[PDB]
Amino acid sequence: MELLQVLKRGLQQVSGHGGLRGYLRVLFRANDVRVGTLVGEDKYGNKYY
Amino acid sequence: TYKYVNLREPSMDMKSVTDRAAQTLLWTELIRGLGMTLSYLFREPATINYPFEKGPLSPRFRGEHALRRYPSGEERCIACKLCEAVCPAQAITIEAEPRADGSRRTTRYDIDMTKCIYCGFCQEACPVDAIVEGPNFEFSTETHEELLYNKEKLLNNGDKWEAEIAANIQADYLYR
Amino acid sequence: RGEYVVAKLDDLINWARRSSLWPMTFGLACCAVEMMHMAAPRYDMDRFGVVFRASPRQSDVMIVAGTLTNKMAPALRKVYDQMPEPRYVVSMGSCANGGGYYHYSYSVVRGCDRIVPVDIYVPGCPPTAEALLYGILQLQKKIKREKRLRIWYRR
Amino acid sequence: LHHAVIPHGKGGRSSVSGIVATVFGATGFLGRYVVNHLGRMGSQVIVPHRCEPYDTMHLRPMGDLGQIIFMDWNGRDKDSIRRAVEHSSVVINLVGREWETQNFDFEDVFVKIPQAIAQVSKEAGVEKFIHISHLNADIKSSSKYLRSKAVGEKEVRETFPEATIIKPAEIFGREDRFLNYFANIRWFGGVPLISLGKKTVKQPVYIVDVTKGIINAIKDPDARGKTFAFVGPSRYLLFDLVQYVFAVAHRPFLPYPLPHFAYRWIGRLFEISPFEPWTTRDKVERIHTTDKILPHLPGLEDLGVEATPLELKAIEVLRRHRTYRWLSSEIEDVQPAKTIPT
Amino acid sequence: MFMINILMLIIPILLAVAFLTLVERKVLGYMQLRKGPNVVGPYGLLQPIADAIKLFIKEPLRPATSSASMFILAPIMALGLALTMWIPLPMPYPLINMNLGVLFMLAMSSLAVYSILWSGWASNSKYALIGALRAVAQTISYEVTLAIILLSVLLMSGSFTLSTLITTQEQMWLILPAWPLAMMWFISTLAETNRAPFDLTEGESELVSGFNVEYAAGPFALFFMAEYANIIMMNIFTAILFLGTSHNPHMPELYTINFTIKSLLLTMSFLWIRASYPRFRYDQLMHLLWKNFLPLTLALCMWHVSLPILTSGIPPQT
Amino acid sequence: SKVKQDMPPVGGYGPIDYKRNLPRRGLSGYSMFAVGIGALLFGYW
């Protein structure tokens, strides 16, 4: 049932950020809690998804 | 040819008449409008998450100016004053003299970024690809005096954005 | 130290003001088109708290977008003076900045900062809607650095 | 005054007037007119400020590109003074307060600060210096404001012998505390006056005249090492002057006599304000302090400035205080106040 | 324990009004393919708090041409009467159980119109005056029709008591027997509460801001709070008249749940409509009611005086 | 090499709809009134 998959993708976003503290860091810093495939990082600590 | 947009005559039979009466009294045609907005409520918005997400651009974009160098490090500009002679807004000021080693080089190269119309003519008129417009479009200042660029500020920009300017010129010079 | 407490009241009022900027419905020329596109769905300025209002008395920011002419100069100052303080001015585009393509004309004010005090200057002709949004987000950072209550305390 | 300090142009916004000016206290009432005139003629003005930068925005349209410069300074910091005056050919001091805050007394602001500014200016080789004293300043006053004004007037002369001390009377203008002060007494019904204002004489001067006088001092080499008394053309009894203010504003005038000692007690009450006090014991003293008559000091006329009558330029200040019923009243509608002849 | 009850009424109401601003902005945002406030706090939940503080630390200014005493009375009169409309509302127990509650709400609604007339007149501006006299015109349009629609409904409830509307609808909603009146009542509340397509007194696109173009800072905030308190209050009124919930004396909480949900959906419809239609013209708003609603409302008023008699369905007087 | 330019596909681009398309919806006038009147009678009873 697609409707249950929606919840699972919602929960995989908590575990995708390394836990609850990581989930809230991106929620407040970026107002967006999606999970992407890390393309890479630069010398200043910026991460690219 | 042509076509009439609002040249119609309603059907006056009883069923067609009653359909219009039912629409008038029951507001049916005002409820299609509510259907249209309701569909949009359950669509995904087209918004991006600025500044974490940026709108797409292209190699031809015309942003902040810069002055380039050769791979050696010598300046490309040889003070020909073609960019100055074509600037529609007269935003470029240039002076030149023979350098210590006798090279035709500029002593002054100013761009008034509040007079520039970001038209790109200066880089079209440059025969050595010295003046370009980088891809940067986020250089808002806090004082009017910060937008008057001199040769030091422009040379700094080239050294700051060179890695990207070269990539865009490589991907676009075959159209020029 | 009592200076700490006021330094935390400053954060509150500064946060309330940068979080609820209300620009005036004031555009002049082509730049005002790119100001509409900042209200369009892609950038949706309203999601930063930025909401246009028509009345000068209900506005916090004037976004001078376009050319200012000698015939229009008295009108711009009036609506600015009618904005309650604190008030901020953003100069969008090159006509509003230093005259732009019409600097040397006879009917154009060379720079909107001759008529009003300006905080942020946005370069471009027109500045992309994304460029203007950078200007507004830079204005919020300028309001976050205000220390009105920490300066009153030390008087 | 080398090649870069020679005038050019025709004295406009984009002209070079060969003046480099540091104005302390440029965010005050008198500051915004000195800066306005200096920038009108194309002068490089340095503006050290103590307040929030937002409180200087009004000064930005007053000067051409790159002409008005802002610096963060501190009255008690000797280095910040030097960083701001070291390049100036003239320093103009306008620092002052009408009340004593928890951090600055009248001796801090009218003795210790002006002396420090003058000292560092001389150490930096500043050619000209201008100090704004008060007309009524004297050692034997009952007001700390005027007493400290007298000590400062004496320290500056010692530190900077070539300074041009200026002694304005009460100054009236749009943002004054002189005509707006009386007009705002209406909030309390009556208009208390010590002795009913029949034994106090005032000779106010217009704001622009003080400014035009200051600018003429800068350019006039004969004003070096001299003292001036800027004053209006006419002397009015305080009662007749305050009666005029309520006449122009078209407000009911209900003066009553209040004893000097009781007036101070009220002055003690308002001082509890942690903000700009509405009135203070010190301010009451100044209000009822008769304006001096100094016939030996040079005045405005010696600087080429014609004193502006109060009647001509009083409506512009007080039209704001009238109700809608009387906004459209004209200048001629009120007969001028009674003057004290010489 | 009565003063505690009043505070327990007005204080939540202000909070609901504050967050209705967020809901409208976020709802209109998604119908418009935007996202609405989402940056100020998680999902914008702090957006109302930022706006409220910003307004009250701003500078209020009285225009030079204003009438001071009336200019300040209007916002006080506006918000005070907005919170007054709530005291007799059964939810399921009213704070003040008025025997003539329906008349009381009618009268207070009329009195609240003068907070618009006096604000626009005291401003002493032409856009402020044009908006003031669009409220005179707008009230002349719906006041008579809205009163008669209530009378028609009350001919099936039996009394003006608001709590009796609950008893009347213990077997079935009043929208079924009276759906034609509900349609004309819903549009009347749109017009009465000055809402699009009937938000003519303010008229941003035509009068800059209407009667309140001269109001800023806190004084403006009181008008904004008053306007939204009416939006919630009238939709609570609509739910009680036509969508009457069932009351269980032992579990009054269940009523407040069903009652609140119905009032929310009716309130979302107000936002939904504002994002769907253009604006009437203030002379057409008058012809809509006098030439379409009034002829039909008078006919239905007759039908509801005769229907109970010819069917022996007259309700009890008490 | 040959000349490479931004050109359409060999067979051309597919069709593009451009005419108005407002589908007919809903029941006729008579049916909408029957349900309207029908509800009243039940409501009255």
Ligand SMILES: NC(=O)C1=CN([C@@H]2O[C@H](COP(=O)(O)OP(=O)(O)OC[C@H]3O[C@@H](n4cnc5c(N)ncnc54)[C@H](OP(=O)(O)O)[C@@H]3O)[C@@H](O)[C@H]2O)C=CC1
């Ligand atoms: N009626 C009059 O106005 C008279 C004027 N004068 C004198 O003219 C001078 C200025 O005129 P006026 O406009 O009336 O004064 P204002 O009160 O209007 O302004 C005072 C200026 O001095 C600054 N100031 C005060 N204290 C300090 C301090 N510790 N550190 C730094 N700056 C300080 C203020 O800076 P900020 O507020 O930004 O912190 C402000 O810019 C005063 O010395 C006054 O005594 C003499 C005769 C009459």
Ligand code: SF4
């Ligand atoms: S982009 Fe156009 S206006 Fe700008 S400097 Fe180049 S030529 Fe001049």
Ligand code: SF4
């Ligand atoms: S056109 Fe190019 S080479 Fe010539 S002056 Fe301009 S930047 Fe230099």
Ligand code: SF4
């Ligand atoms: S700055 Fe550019 S876009 Fe803006 S008004 Fe001028 S020419 Fe038009």
